[PDB]
Amino acid sequence: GIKVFGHPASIATRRVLIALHEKNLDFELVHVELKDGEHKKEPFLSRNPFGQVPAFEDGDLKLFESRAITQYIAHRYENQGTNLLQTDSKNISQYAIMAIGMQVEDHQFDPVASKLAFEQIFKSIYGLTTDEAVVAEEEAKLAKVLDVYEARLKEFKYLAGETFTLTDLHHIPAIQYLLGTPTKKLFTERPRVNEWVAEITKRPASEKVQ
Amino acid sequence: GIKVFGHPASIATRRVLIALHEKNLDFELVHVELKDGEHKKEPFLSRNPFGQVPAFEDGDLKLFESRAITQYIAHRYENQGTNLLQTDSKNISQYAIMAIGMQVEDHQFDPVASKLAFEQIFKSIYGLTTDEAVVAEEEAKLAKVLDVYEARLKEFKYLAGETFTLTDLHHIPAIQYLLGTPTKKLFTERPRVNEWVAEITKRPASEKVQ
Incomplete structure (x- = not known):
């Protein structure tokens, strides 16, 4: 139930x-x-x-x-x-990698991508104007987060390994929204992040929520 | 190492x-x-x-x-x-209970108790005055969190079961600081929270960090 x-x-x-x-x-x-x-x-x-x-x-x-x-x-x-x-449940190294990854998106990514999606997708609903100052400010922090992911994804195929995990999934909702925003330039201007984003969002389970 | x-x-x-x-x-x-x-x-x-x-x-x-x-x-x-x-690692019910608990302290408790400890213990270091408006505002949210814990602790001995877990531990640092602040009234005015706080803070591993 x-x-x-x-x-x-x-x-x-x-x-x-x-x-x-x-x-x-x-x-x-x-x-x-x-x-x-x-x-x-x-x-x-x-x-x-x-x-x-x-x-x-x-x-x-x-x-x-x-x-x-x-x-x-x-x-x-x-x-x-x-x-x-994680693929191997007995691998403590893979456990620690995903723990950090789930802690990172929740503290470093989610807070920024939410404020950015709000200012540019929900404010516009009620005819409000996006605070250009805030937008650029929060975009500065997100590029920082994405530079770190760009590093991760040059070694791994996904954020917490060579496999799709809850780590990648947690970002999906926020990324879908930012994609239909000029903020999508930050994901596109980075090779690995671009490719990775196009992977996780073109998943049928992902396509079923937009 | x-x-x-x-x-x-x-x-x-x-x-x-x-x-x-x-x-x-x-x-x-x-x-x-x-x-x-x-x-x-x-x-x-x-x-x-x-x-x-x-x-x-x-x-x-x-x-x-x-x-x-x-x-x-x-x-x-x-x-x-x-x-x-958790005591029984195969108990999914105990797993879910601690997951919520670790998600709650990080989102509902930590953000409040930090702002409260800052305004009342670190600002005073640099001779700054505590924003009385902010203090009362953040104290309103913390009492809300503590009312929920008061409910939890009437059934459980600890936040995620009858055992001391990472759930309880994560709060320790913040609670130690608030204790030496008039904010300690919120922990004391609730029977279970009071008793629970006096348990987790009087632990030798806890006493080794103050």
Whole structure:
């Protein structure tokens, strides 16, 4: 009984939909009206007391926080679909590599790419103008992150190894949005990042969420 | 060959020292002068390209990002010292519980308790005044986090089970600092949180970092 509680335009929720499709799982996307302030009132507060989407439910097991859910799915449904984990589970070196990688995207990438997608895709919805100063400022930090990935991808085929992992997946939602923004120049101006981005986004599980 | 590269007053570095002591490991705390801008220049940039502490090194394996290091230690040195992981490793329910818990402290707790410790312990160092408006604002969010923990701790003895895990440990550094601040009233005004805080901070591995 898989029920994802969220908003289909949310980057955090899309992150959970892709992982679900990646494991050919069946679920029901229970929509939460963020505009009606639903998430900030019972009974959603019993699903996520911090009042945010997504919230998840695998039968009786309840979770929230998108990366905690992806990891749950990754293990709980390991012997099914694509392996979103390291190839050799006994390799501590591959474990440490993915740990850093999942810590990096969450602290260094996500915060920047979100502010950038907001200023350039959600503000424009309500006819607001993008703060050009902020945009350029956050773009400076993202190029820094991408220069590090450019290094990683010259050795590895993916961010945490020669295999597609949750590390790469966590970026997908944010990258899809930035792609339809002039910010896409940062991904294209780097050879490895460009190729890598065109790989992870042209995946059918990825194409099923846009 | 364990060498921790950081600053002994850093919350993120203390988080790595406690885990190390918890596994009775031996290491060398290589100090980085943040004041001299060391971390923002080679060769530290080769240890952590994002220029922050801590940076770690277990012989040849290099890491950074404090929670990625703790998890490394937790597994790489599992059959040694205190088990900073779930009691039953095959219990997916206990896995999911700790995943959410580690995602929660990092997103909901750490950001607040840091801003609160800065405004009230590091600003006062340089004779600066604490922004009373900010303090009260961030304290409102922390009480929210602590109300959720108060719920958790009424069922569990610790945050992710009846056992001391990396979930509880990650909070230790921030809590030590807030304790010597009027912010300690939020931890004391809640029965379970109070008792739990007095448990995790009176641990010898915890007492070795203040």
